[PDB]
């Protein structure tokens, strides 16, 4: 029972290190973004920088896009 | 009197009336979807599509005193909908205590309890009595005699108020009567050969009629004084009247009317007598009585147009030859139609829009072209009847009488 106590407190150390290490990281989002539009031409077009505003740097990663 | 049509891929599985004394009739209906649909009887349209907040609705029932509405859903929920707010306005009230299997049929005891037969072979009893301690939680569960080689589904549940029982038909064909207090079986009959889809009772609960996919209607009677003082139903009688199935059964009983009405997979209706079921006579209605027509002919070109759901077809006499058809699928629902004398322009018209098509006989075929008119494209039409080769008169679903190609003064009626 005391070496089970030893392994259990080692496990709890790593558990707390895990949770308050993952609390201070940032993970890349992966969500199905959906945009609702009007009749058919707004859907046929490219969504023309409606929130990208550059098609090179600030389009395809969404953790912070920008408006210059 | 009236017909309220629905369109492509629309069905209707349950429907219940509601008439609080002094107010208009109200008609709710579930389809195969997540909403309840309340219809206003004037126009023949939905006036409310209340999306019930849990899953696909399998059954609907109306409270006694008709202020609440149970919808029993596919994810095992029983949702209460507050009805008494006036015609049209429906509120969510309470989701009752959940379960695993889908609740396939509902009934109410009174304003107090709600009984539900589910697809795991069981019959739950919830309490919908507001301001009790056990409101919404399921008080009892009963289990019917399962089939040996397939799953059992309890398909029909009614409450019998003269005694204190629940009658229940399930998919083994067995019909069971359960004492409500003590929540337990009194007697089971092995009546049908396959499922019992629908069962009903009369006013004083001297009879219980029942029917299902084996297409016989069974009658269980308790009319003897010894039957009433011993609480013992007998399997009285049995009739074979339907051709394929019976999916719906109901009963009406008044001073000059006592008939049970039944219909099924074969499309016809059947009327029998309630207190004289086995003895008396019955009437199998015609499968269609065309109070609203789907066919009309024009004498020029010897031709006839006919519209089923969302397609029209035209053929000529000669033999006969199908000259043209219009499977307009921008449409979803059809209604009435008329052709011009000389056979030039067809006009099809439903309660949401109408559309007019020029026709030209190109020989052994026709050529049909839409002619645009946005007044027609915006108006609701019931009847179009062609004053001239160009002038038609339009009766709108909101009681307007136009004359196009404009307004008839129409006096009011005493309400």
């Amino acid at each position: 029972t005391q070496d089970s106590n030893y392994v259990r407190t080692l496990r709890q150390i790593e558990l707390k290190k895990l949770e308050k290490g993952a609390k201070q990281l940032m993970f890349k989002s992966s969500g199905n973004h959906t945009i609702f539009v009007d009749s058919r031409e707004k859907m046929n077009e490219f969504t023309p920088e409606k929130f990208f505003n550059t098609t090179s740097e600030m389009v395809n990663r969404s953790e912070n896009r920008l408006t210059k | 009197e009236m017909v309220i049509e629905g369109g492509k891929d629309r069905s209707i599985e349950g429907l219940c009336w509601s008439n609080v004394n002094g107010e208009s009739l109200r008609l709710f209906s579930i389809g195969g979807s997540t909403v309840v649909t309340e219809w206003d009887l004037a126009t023949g349209l939905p006036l409310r599509n209340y999306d019930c907040n849990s899953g696909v609705i399998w059954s609907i029932s109306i409270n006694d005193s008709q202020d609440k509405l149970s919808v029993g859903c596919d994810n095992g929920t029983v949702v209460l909908i507050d009805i008494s707010g006036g015609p049209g306005v429906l509120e969510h009230d309470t989701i009752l205590m959940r379960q695993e299997a889908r609740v396939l049929t509902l009934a109410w005891k009174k304003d107090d309890f709600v009984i539900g037969g589910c697809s795991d072979g069981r019959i739950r009893i919830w309490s919908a009595q507001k301001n009790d301690e056990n409101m919404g939680r399921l008080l009892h569960t009963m289990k019917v005699d399962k089939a040996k080689k397939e799953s059992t589904l309890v398909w029909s549940v009614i409450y019998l108020p003269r005694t204190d029982q629940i009658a229940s038909g399930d998919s083994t064909g067995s019909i069971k009567f359960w004492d409500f207090q003590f929540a337990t079986l009194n007697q089971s009959f092995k009546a049908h050969d396959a499922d019992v889809l629908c069962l009903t009772t009369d006013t004083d609960n001297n009879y219980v009629f029942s029917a299902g996919v084996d297409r016989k209607i069974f009658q269980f009677s308790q009319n003897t004084n010894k039957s009433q003082k011993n609480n013992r139903w007998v399997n009285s009688s049995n009739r074979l009247l339907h051709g394929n199935d019976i999916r719906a059964i109901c009963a009406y009983q008044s001073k000059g009317a006592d008939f049970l009405v039944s219909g099924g997979v074969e499309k016809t209706l059947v009327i029998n007598s309630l207190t004289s079921f086995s003895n008396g006579n019955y009437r199998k209605m015609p499968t269609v009585e065309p109070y609203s027509k789907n066919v009309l002919v024009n004498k020029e070109q010897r031709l006839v147009v006919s519209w089923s759901e969302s397609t029209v077809k035209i053929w000529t006499m000669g033999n006969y030859k199908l000259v043209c058809k219009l499977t307009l699928k921008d449409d979803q629902n059809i209604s009435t139609c008329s052709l011009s004398p000389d056979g030039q322009v067809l006009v099809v018209g439903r309660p949401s829009t109408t559309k007019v098509f020029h026709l030209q006989p190109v020989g052994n075929k026709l050529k049909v072209t839409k002619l645009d008119n946005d007044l027609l494209l915006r108006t609701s039409t019931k009847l179009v009847k062609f004053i001239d080769n160009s002038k038609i008169v339009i009766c709108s679903c909101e009681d307007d009488v136009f004359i196009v190609d404009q307004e008839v003064e129409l006096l009011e009626v005493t309400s």
Binding site: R8, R11, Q12, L15 | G76, M97, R98, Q99, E100, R122, E133, R137, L138, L139, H140, T141
Partner: protein
């Protein structure tokens, strides 16, 4: 008791106490409120069963408060005496935590009962 949220009906409480009896035979439950909270802290509990029968219920209704932090299912059954019979000791048991396992024989029964629990949340 009013403040014992989700309480099980008879069929669900019968299968809850059946899986409690076979977990007690497989030595896969921690019986008692302090052992239940220890498994809640360590994150090795599948679901928590409590008894809506203790005369202070506030000696119980604190492990809900850290069940809803670790989104572990919890349920109430009406009898501490019957929970103690199911756990297989001679005393009444107020709370019991079914511990986690991945080679367990009754893993499917545990998963079925915990899904029936989280339907009523």
């Amino acid at each position: 008791n009013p403040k014992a949220f989700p309480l099980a009906d008879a069929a669900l409480t019968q299968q809850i106490l059946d899986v409690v009896q076979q977990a007690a035979n497989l030595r896969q439950l921690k019986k008692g409120a302090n052992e239940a909270t220890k498994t809640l802290n360590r994150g090795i509990s599948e679901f928590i069963i409590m008894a809506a029968d203790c005369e202070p219920i506030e000696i119980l209704l604190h492990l809900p408060l850290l069940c809803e932090d670790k989104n572990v299912p919890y349920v109430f059954v009406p009898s501490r005496v019957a929970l103690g019979r199911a756990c297989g000791v001679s005393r009444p048991v107020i709370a019991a935590s079914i511990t986690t396992n991945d080679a367990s024989a009754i893993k499917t029964q545990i998963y079925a009962v915990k899904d029936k629990i989280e339907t009523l949340l």
